Design a protein around this ligand. Structure first.
Ligand SMILES: CCCCCCCCCCCCCCCCCC(=O)OC[C@H](COP(=O)(O)OCCN)OC(=O)CCCCCCCCCCCCCCCCC
Ligand SMILES: CCCCCCCCCCCCCCCCCC(=O)OC[C@H](COP(=O)(O)OCCN)OC(=O)CCCCCCCCCCCCCCCCC
Ligand SMILES: CCCCCCCCCCCCCCCCCC(=O)OC[C@H](COP(=O)(O)OCCN)OC(=O)CCCCCCCCCCCCCCCCC
Ligand SMILES: CCCCCCCCCCCCCCCCCC(=O)OC[C@H](COP(=O)(O)OCCN)OC(=O)CCCCCCCCCCCCCCCCC
Ligand SMILES: CCCCCCCCCCCCCCCCCC(=O)OC[C@H](COP(=O)(O)OCCN)OC(=O)CCCCCCCCCCCCCCCCC
Ligand code: FES
Lengths: 230, 62, 72, 149, 168, 144, 248, 53, 40, 64, 89, 146, 229, 62
């Protein structure tokens, strides 16, 4: 019965696609007959929410999603999550899950590899209260809870960042690596620096909360200027 | 030849199957048998695979 | 092929069929000379349009042999 | 098979009803209908013009408009004046072709090739010995295209 | 239909050799296979054209109800033997088989040697059995035995296992 | 016109042309293939325009007269019809585009000599001349 | 002329009747097809222009800029001087701190000018080149400075006049980069004093980028009718003979 | 450059050909000195033309 | 290349997670980062 | 259904939290792969049911 | 087949020679089709490759009648024999 | 290269083979090539005029650039990449392949005894500072001007 | 001057007769920008928010190339060695996200890590790999089939045939992802229906003579690329 | 105005700026009108001035 329902869903989707294509073609033909050029406007095709068939992005309305960002495929954003400007989350291969109160910086690219070995999730899972700097590149990583990632940081597939860890900016966590909790790691080959202090932990939490508030302010400002959906 | 053990019965074999280098991606190891006579992925009968995450988020937004 | 060569064949088949007692030997000689003259040449060309032209020529000689068989 | 009555506006449709796929008849073969004027002249054919030929011209005029538009659909880098002139020339050509078709229909009616309201005293007796089309046409649209089945 | 089904085995074989083979030398091997097997097919085509044109039929029983003269039977047997020996292969028409087997993918090499040559044998058996032939088969026997000897004497000088299996 | 055509199997215009079933079927077959090739040619010309109006007008003239060859009841009228068709084919060869817009910017201040156009015209002209004189001699001696 | 009168009458009829009818039917069909496909589909939207975004009272002053990319993002208190260039994908957030771009300053593709602290002015001087994929953070970049592509100027950095940061270099926080010095490496260190030839190369690179930004502004700021005319011109040039070019 | 195809413009002047192309000395002489020849300079091209003749 | 799914659902892969213990303390300034997955 | 990623895992050791996240991600990936395979297999059965009989009709008409 | 029906063994032999030589002449170019990478042979219109659907459909029809044309050759033979039957009657 | 772990990359300028050319207008060019490429590839990358290169390097399998040249090769497919090499490197090249010589002598434009086909020349380290001349090559077909 | 609600961004833009060309099955992201004379190969996927400027010099890109997000490819106009300063990218090249390419030659089967900066005059030979967060100094040669890492990049180790084939296979996997993304877009833009009529739209202040339409013959042209204008 | 349904403007219309230069010329008026007659007289007189003998040999002989 499940296969029959899937077949019915695909048949209805294809019928709707056919009807929409026929309607757009008829409108273009009438545009031609009227001596009209409205049909020829090279408006941008970018869609900040691009579902890959059944892989529909899902997010709470509390989230802030930049108009120029691109959420493709199976993306699941938690409450109050802020997505930076130009950030791409490609869930075409596997799901990209982001926790509550998580900040993703501008120009941050998150994607997944095709396959990985056993016991290694191929999905990019990001915990709650994570702060990700601008210009980061995440691939099939597991960032858990209150983790700070510096700007221009590359996290490779199979990497696991444990709760309460800080990665210095302009760093690279290689594939299959583990960042222990409560530690600072720096350098393109990430090396241990020091154990985090209470002051540093509080400062990072305050900074990510400030980023969340800034994202809320950005959404409020963009809604007023008619630059935001809904 | 003495240390060779690709199936991990005598020398333990990681599920990750290899330690990736700090300059290489985490590609899988090539299997000893490269047969491509594989079915589609087999899931147990009566497998509940509904998109529970999306359903919960839609319920919250509704 | 559809007009010029067709009228060539019909000249040997329909329009001047009463002269086939002389046509057969000339057609046979031309066919033999063409077959033994182009077999080497079709293998020293290196051009696409030359290939197309020689395909046309080979088919023409085959059809000339066919019309020779017809006028028998 | 029935044919559209001549001297009506659908008499030109009888040109599309042929009893045999032959282009022409033999030298001594009798035409399907009695001959009115075998030695027809141009003015004889003109005098034999009627509603069938006028309807052929009207059909050419009606179908010639979309055909002229279709021809013009490939025209580019042209002013409105040249576009209108090209359309007028193509449409006039199609109407002239309709006039030619009407002239041919009148000539055929004079020679008895198509229906002219006359019937031979004794019809030619033909045995349909080889018949691959009767059962096919009696259960299809093509009974309207072959005369006498 | 028999002749056509015998003739339909070339296109899939050439497509397999041309696109599935990993070796770069297999393109020329595919060309050799096509040209040799198609020359054999042309000879068989001439023979079947003789059979069809002389006795206008398509049935082996109708062939049983007809007799070919000595010259016609000789031409038919020579043509069918030479064509199906191009496909068999026979001496000296096994160059294509050697090149293809050396260069074809292993799956096709299993299928080419295992089966298609047997289709050639079946075609020859069906063609020759239905026709009365009054000539001495010593020439064909000599050709077959020369092929056997020629193939057997070359097995020592093969360092390539696939080419050795091709000679076998 | 050919589909609705009717008449007697005879020769018209002083027996210089023949109206018989085979000749008319050849006429129709030639026109049908010309229509197919012209349709494909239009579909191609909508892609890239490397040809002029005169080229397709030459093609128009070929397609109009080349079926008339099969209606010839005489080698005389056949010779004149093929002379007209050969003139049309020479016209078609003449109006081929010589220079193109290409990404070859290395030849703007140097003289490149392409001789294919002159070779085509020369060989077509001389083959036409030889064929025409031989056919004329054959006609003269067949009249004898 | 009956033929021409029929032609004109059918032209008027076809346009004024079939055009609107076909367009209405097509719009209805497109709408119902989109409704059927839901929710497993998306429709083309109207992409917002994010290059002049204001926050509360922070309003950009970018009218003096010679080029601002249509897909760039300029939010908040970002003030640019005359001749400024902001290229494609750049992001200048003035809400997290004031941004002051000088005259003839090039901010290349996908450059993020973002302040690390809550309220810190990011002051880039005049004739300053910033390479693509750069990340500038709450820094004071004096006049005629060069920042290579893929470079990261950290929070406390101060780049003196005529200071060169090689491409791919990451200047550490609170690092003072002296004048006429080239620094390189992920830990940015003083590489060498810049030769006058390399200085001339950098000046020519900056002038070339300024003029290229001017050209891009000429191209990207075209109206829809101008873009359609350009498309028609391109398709005409795809079939123009040498005779037509000579005629032009 | 508008209307000049792939030809680019540098800093001190505008190119006379596509990028990474061969600069023609005769073209440079024609553009710089429009009609002034102090002497009939025999270059390799002129010597080769004389040899061909 | 192989493209099947290692994370099967019909059963759980028999694994031993105690053979290799990832380092979590005492790292030096030049040591590499530990490995996340060490099950055999 | 409980979303482990969107849950209070801070009452556990970091290793336990990351292990729970990994297990939840693996289970949800298996579910997503099952759904994707179901939708892909639907793209086979529909053409098999719809066009196979037209293909057989065409072949039969062409042959016998 | 017709040459055999007309009993022309020498004509059959020369037809076979020409056929085999031309066949290798044609299939020789199949070796040249091997390319180290996929080619770029399509014209560019509106910044993208111009693929003509009409010509593609024509090629589809021609490919159908080239692959399975032997199944429908009898009707073409009937039509051509019917056309040729008028030559002398 | 025999690089070791931690070794820095080598300069491209130190791996450049220099070809000094006399263009048909009798003009001196200096282009850069890399070992393993063909002279035709180098000339076309550097946009060198005078080389028509109708067949564009010939076949992609069993090429004339291989060492050794396969006996089943079809060789060059035109005579448009003709370059007149200078005496030292011409002698170092050796004697012509039979197919290459056949294509060279079957040229509508006159050739020389130092003439070679550019796509049949493989760039080598000893071809540094190699002097060639490139007089204008013939145009074979109607599409050489397309 | 810069105040509007609808973005003016076009994915493909020309610059004074420098028209980009794109092959079949190639997916240029609508968020991405391709300017100048850029020749994209067949089945090449340029992902989102990537800039490719073939303005000062041409940019030829091979067939099965995958350019990641936030990647800036641009040319230099001139190189010190006199070589052509145009970007030439091989046929199976995987450029990682947030990469920078500055007028360098990249041969086939080359993998560039995420966050890599490949400067002017660099020549990455066939089959090479550069690890993530690496900078190739200007005018440097990377030997074929070698693995490098660092800033500046230093030799790590030679690559095996298995690793080379793995990279080749990874190059081919992006094709079906690009196919899915293309399938999510219909050939007809539906954004024009969502705009409001303007005075300029209803009353053209200037008229131009009728010429060849940019979409002439498009009823016969296959809609292979849904993102075509 | 703008007749929006959901998100689609059913009154969306951009007047084409590409019109023939002779769209409102006198010669393009319907044949037989005074404006058309004026334009046609001018065209015929111009042609006759350019082609005196041609017009004589064609129209006069016709
Ligand atoms: C509850 C609602 C359910 C709705 C179900 C579907 C309803 C369909 C209603 C159709 C209404 C038709 C109105 C009259 C249209 C007449 C056709 C026409 O005008 O065609 C001309 C035009 C030419 O287009 P073209 O050559 O491409 O030129 C483009 C110019 N820029 O051609 C075009 O522009 C192409 C569009 C033609 C549209 C009509 C085609 C009808 C064919 C029969 C139906 C087949 C099913 C189609 C839909 C798929 C259903 C699964
Ligand atoms: C129960 C049913 C209810 C209703 C169902 C729905 C409606 C059904 C409608 C059925 C069809 C209606 C047809 C209306 C008239 C069509 C007229 C037509 O197509 O005629 C074709 C023409 C007629 O042949 P014929 O009359 O013999 O020729 C003239 C002889 N005086 O024939 C010819 O021109 C023949 C030409 C012969 C020579 C050329 C062809 C043979 C050689 C080439 C073979 C093919 C190769 C490719 C050629 C190019 C193809 C484009
Ligand atoms: C190439 C395509 C095939 C060409 C075959 C040409 C055969 C020509 C035969 C001419 C002839 O008349 O041969 C007669 C000769 C002896 O026949 P005989 O036994 O005397 O006949 C009396 C009763 N019929 O017959 C013979 O001696 C038999 C001739 C066989 C020739 C080889 C057959 C094809 C081999 C490839
Ligand atoms: C062939 C193999 C068919 C069975 C495959 C299978 O079992 O797929 C799993 C799923 C059923 O799940 P489950 O019962 O758990 O099976 C797993 C263990 N037996 O299977 C399914 O849900 C069905 C999956 C079918 C996939 C292939 C379908 C191909 C299309 C065939 C359609 C029928 C066409 C018949 C002719 C139509 C025209 C007349
Ligand atoms: C010999 C006689 C040829 C025919 C003479 C016709 C005379 C005629 O109809 O004249 C009327 C018209 C107006 O003449 P007019 O009174 O001078 O007007 C001045 C202000 N209304 O005058 C005209 O239309 C002038 C016609 C002059 C023709 C002179 C002969 C030229 C050769 C024959 C030309 C045929 C076509 C004439 C029209 C060409 C287009 C204008
Ligand atoms: S380019 Fe053709 S032979 Fe060298």
């Amino acid at each position: 019965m499940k296969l029959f329902q899937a077949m019915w869903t695909r048949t209805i989707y294809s019928i709707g696609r056919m009807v929409r294509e026929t309607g757009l073609a008829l409108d273009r033909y009438g545009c031609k007959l009227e001596q009209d050029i409205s049909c020829y406007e090279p408006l941008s095709r970018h869609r900040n929410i691009l579902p890959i068939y059944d892989l529909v992005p899902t997010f709470y309305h509390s989230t802030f999603i930049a108009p120029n960002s691109s959420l493709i495929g199976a993306v699941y954003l938690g409450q109050n999550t802020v997505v930076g400007y130009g950030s791409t989350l490609r869930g075409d291969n596997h799901a990209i899950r982001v926790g509550h109160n998580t900040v993703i910086g501008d120009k941050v690219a998150i994607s997944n590899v095709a396959t990985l070995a056993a016991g290694i999730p191929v999905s990019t899972n990001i915990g709650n209260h994570v702060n990700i700097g601008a210009g980061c590149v995440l691939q099939s990583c597991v960032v858990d809870d209150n983790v700070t990632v510096g700007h221009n940081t590359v996290i490779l597939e199979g990497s696991v960042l444990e709760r309460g860890s800080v990665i210095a900016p302009n760093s690279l966590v290689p594939a299959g690596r583990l960042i222990p909790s409560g530690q600072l790691w720096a350098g393109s080959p990430v090396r241990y620096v020091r154990d985090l202090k209470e002051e540093e932990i509080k400062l990072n939490l305050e900074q990510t909360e400030q980023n969340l508030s800034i994202g809320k302010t950005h959404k409020s400002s963009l809604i007023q200027q008619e630059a935001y959906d809904r | 030849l003495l240390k060779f053990d690709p199936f991990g019965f005598y020398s333990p074999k990681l599920l990750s199957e290899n330690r990736p280098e700090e300059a290489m991606p985490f590609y899988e190891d090539y299997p000893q048998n490269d047969s491509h006579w594989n079915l589609w992925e087999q899931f147990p009968e009566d497998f509940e695979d509904s998109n529970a995450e999306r359903e919960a988020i839609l319920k919250s937004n509704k | 092929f559809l007009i010029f060569f067709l009228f060539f064949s019909l000249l040997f088949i329909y329009y001047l069929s009463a002269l086939n007692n002389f046509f057969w030997i000339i057609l046979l000689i031309i066919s033999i000379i063409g077959i033994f003259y182009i077999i080497s040449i079709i293998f020293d060309i290196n051009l696409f349009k030359a290939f197309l032209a020689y395909s046309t020529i080979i088919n023409s000689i085959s059809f000339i042999l066919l019309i020779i068989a017809i006028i028998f | 098979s029935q044919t559209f009555a001549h001297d009506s506006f659908l008499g030109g449709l009888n040109l599309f009803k042929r009893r045999d796929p032959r282009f022409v008849l033999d030298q001594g073969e009798r035409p399907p209908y009695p001959i009115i004027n075998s030695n027809s002249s141009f003015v004889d054919v003109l005098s034999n013009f009627n509603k069938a030929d006028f309807g052929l011209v009207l059909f050419s005029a009606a179908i010639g408009f979309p055909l002229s538009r279709w021809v013009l659909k490939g025209l580019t880098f042209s002013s409105l004046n040249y576009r209108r002139g090209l359309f007028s020339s193509v449409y006039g050509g199609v109407i002239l072709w309709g006039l030619v078709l009407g002239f041919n229909n009148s000539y055929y009616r004079l020679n008895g090739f198509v229906d002219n309201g006359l019937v031979w005293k004794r019809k030619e007796r033909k045995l349909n010995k080889y018949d691959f089309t009767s059962e096919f046409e009696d259960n299809s649209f093509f009974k309207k295209l072959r005369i006498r089945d | 239909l028999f002749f056509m089904c015998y003739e339909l085995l070339l296109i899939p074989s050439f497509l397999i050799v041309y696109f599935v083979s990993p070796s770069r030398r297999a393109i020329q091997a595919s060309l050799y296979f096509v040209i040799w097997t198609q020359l054999g097919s042309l000879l068989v085509l001439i023979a079947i054209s003789y059979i069809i044109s002389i006795t206008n039929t398509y049935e082996f029983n109708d062939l049983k109800y007809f007799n070919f003269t000595n010259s016609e039977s000789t031409i038919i047997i020579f043509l069918i033997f030479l064509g199906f020996g191009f496909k068999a292969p026979i001496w000296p028409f096994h160059y294509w088989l050697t090149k293809t087997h050396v260069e074809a993918p292993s799956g096709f090499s299993i299928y080419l040697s295992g089966f298609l040559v047997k289709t050639a044998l079946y075609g020859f058996y069906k063609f020759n059995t239905s026709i009365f032939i009054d000539i001495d088969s010593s020439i064909f026997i000599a050709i077959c035995i020369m092929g056997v000897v020629d193939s057997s004497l070359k097995m020592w000088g093969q360092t390539d296992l696939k080419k050795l299996v091709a000679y076998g | 016109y050919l589909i609705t055509f009717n008449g007697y199997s005879s020769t018209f215009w002083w027996s210089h042309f023949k109206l018989n079933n085979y000749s008319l079927y050849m006429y129709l077959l030639v026109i049908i293939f010309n229509n197919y090739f012209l349709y494909i040619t239009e579909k191609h010309i909508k892609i890239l325009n490397n040809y002029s109006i005169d080229y397709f007008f030459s093609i128009i003239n070929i397609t109009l007269f080349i079926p008339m060859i099969f209606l010839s009841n005489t080698l005389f009228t056949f010779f004149f019809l093929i002379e007209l068709v050969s003139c049309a084919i020479f016209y078609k060869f003449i109006v081929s585009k010589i220079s193109f817009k290409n990404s070859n910017y290395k030849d703007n201040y140097f003289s490149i000599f392409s001789k294919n156009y002159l070779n085509v015209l020369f060989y077509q002209y001389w083959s036409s001349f030889f064929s025409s004189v031989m056919i004329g001699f054959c006609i003269i001696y067949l009249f004898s | 002329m009956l033929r021409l009168r029929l032609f004109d009458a059918y032209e008027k009829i076809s346009m004024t009747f079939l055009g609107p009818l076909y367009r209405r039917i097509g719009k209805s069909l497109a709408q119902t097809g989109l409704n059927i496909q839901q929710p497993y589909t998306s429709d083309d939207r109207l992409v917002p222009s994010l290059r002049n975004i204001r926050v509360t009272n922070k309003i950009p002053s970018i009218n003096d800029s010679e080029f601002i990319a249509p897909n760039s993002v300029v939010i908040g208190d970002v003030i640019t001087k005359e001749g400024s260039s902001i290229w494609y994908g750049a992001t200048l957030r003035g809400e997290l701190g004031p941004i002051e771009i000088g005259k003839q300053t090039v901010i290349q593709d996908l450059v993020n000018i973002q302040s690390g602290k809550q309220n810190q002015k990011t002051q880039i001087g005049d004739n300053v080149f910033i390479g693509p994929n750069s990340y500038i953070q709450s820094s004071k970049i004096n006049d005629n400075s060069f920042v290579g592509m893929g470079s990261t100027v950290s929070t406390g950095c101060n780049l003196a006049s005529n200071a060169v940061v090689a491409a791919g270099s990451v200047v550490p926080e609170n690092t003072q980069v002296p004048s006429n010095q080239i620094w390189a490496g992920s830990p940015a260190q003083y590489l060498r004093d810049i030769t006058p030839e390399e200085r001339q190369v950098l000046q020519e690179h900056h002038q070339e980028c300024v003029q290229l930004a001017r050209i891009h502004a000429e191209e990207t700021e075209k109206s829809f009718r101008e873009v359609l005319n350009d498309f028609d011109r391109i398709t005409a040039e795809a079939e123009y003979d040498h005779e037509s070019l000579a005629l032009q | 450059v508008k209307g000049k195809g792939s030809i680019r413009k540098g800093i001190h002047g505008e190119g006379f050909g596509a990028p990474s192309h061969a600069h023609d000395a005769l073209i440079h002489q024609i553009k710089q000195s429009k009609d002034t020849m102090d002497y009939q300079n025999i270059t390799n091209e002129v010597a080769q033309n004389f040899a061909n003749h | 290349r192989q493209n099947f799914a290692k994370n099967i659902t019909t059963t759980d892969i028999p694994k031993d997670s105690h053979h290799f213990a990832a380092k979590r303390s005492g790292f030096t300034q030049t040591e590499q980062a530990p490995f996340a997955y060490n099950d055999v | 259904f409980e979303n482990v990623l969107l849950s209070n895992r801070k009452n556990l050791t970091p290793q336990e939290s990351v292990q729970k996240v990994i297990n939840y991600a693996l289970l949800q990936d298996a579910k997503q792969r099952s759904r994707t395979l179901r939708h892909i297999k639907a793209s086979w059965v529909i053409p098999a049911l719809l066009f196979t009989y037209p293909a057989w009709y065409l072949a039969k008409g062409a042959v016998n | 087949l017709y040459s055999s029906f007309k009993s022309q063994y020498l004509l059959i032999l020369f037809m076979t020679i020409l056929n085999i030589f031309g066949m290798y002449f044609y299939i020789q170019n199949l070796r040249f089709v091997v390319k180290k990478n996929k080619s770029s042979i399509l014209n560019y219109k509106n910044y993208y490759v111009n693929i003509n659907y009409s010509i593609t459909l024509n090629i589809i029809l021609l490919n159908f009648f080239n692959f399975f044309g032997i199944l429908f050759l009898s009707d073409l033979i009937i039509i051509l024999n019917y056309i040729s039957s008028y030559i002398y009657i | 290269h025999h690089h070791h772990a931690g070794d820095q990359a080598d300069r491209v300028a130190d791996k450049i083979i220099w070809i000094n050319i006399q263009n048909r207008i009798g003009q001196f060019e200096r282009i850069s090539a890399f070992e393993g490429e063909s002279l035709l590839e180098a000339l076309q990358r550097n946009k060198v005029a005078g080389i028509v290169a109708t067949c564009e390097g010939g076949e992609d399998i069993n090429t004339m650039l291989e060492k050794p040249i396969d006996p089943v090769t079809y060789g060059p497919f035109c005579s448009s990449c003709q370059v007149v090499v200078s005496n030292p490197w011409r002698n170092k090249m050796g004697n012509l392949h039979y197919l290459e010589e056949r294509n060279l002598v079957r040229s509508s434009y006159p050739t020389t005894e130092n003439s070679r086909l550019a796509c049949c020349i493989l760039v080598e380290k000893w071809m540094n500072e190699m002097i060639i001349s490139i007089p204008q090559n013939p145009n074979s077909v109607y599409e050489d001007n397309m | 001057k810069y105040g509007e609600n609808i973005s003016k961004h076009r994915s493909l833009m020309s610059l004074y007769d420098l028209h980009p060309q794109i092959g079949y099955q190639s997916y240029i992201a609508p968020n991405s920008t391709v300017i100048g004379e850029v020749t994209i190969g067949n089945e090449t996927t340029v992902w989102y928010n990537s800039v490719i400027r073939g303005d000062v010099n041409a940019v030829q890109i091979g067939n099965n190339v995958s350019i990641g997000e936030n990647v800036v490819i641009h040319t230099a106009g001139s190189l010190p060695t006199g070589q052509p300063a145009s970007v030439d990218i091989g046929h199976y090249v995987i450029i990682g996200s947030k990469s920078t390419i500055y007028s360098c030659t990249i041969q086939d089967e080359v993998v560039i890590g995420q966050g890599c900066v490949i400067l002017e005059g660099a020549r990455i030979e066939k089959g090479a790999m550069i690890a993530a967060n690496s900078v190739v100094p200007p005018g440097r040669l990377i030997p074929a089939g070698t693995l490098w890492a660092g800033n500046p990049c230093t030799f790590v180790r030679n690559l095996t045939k298995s690793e080379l084939a793995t990279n080749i296979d990874h190059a081919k996997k992006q094709l079906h992802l690009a196919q899915q993304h293309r399938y999510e877009y219909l050939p007809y833009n539906s954004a024009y229906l969502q705009k409001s009529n303007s005075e300029e739209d209803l009353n053209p202040t200037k008229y131009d003579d009728v010429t060849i339409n940019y979409n002439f013959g498009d009823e016969e042209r296959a809609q292979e690329n849904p993102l075509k204008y | 105005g703008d007749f929006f349904v959901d998100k689609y403007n059913f009154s969306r219309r951009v007047v084409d700026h590409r019109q023939p230069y002779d769209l409102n010329f006198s010669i393009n008026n319907p044949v037989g009108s005074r404006v058309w007659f004026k334009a046609w007289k001018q065209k015929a007189i111009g042609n006759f001035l350019n082609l005196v003998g041609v017009h004589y040999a064609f129209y006069g002989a016709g």
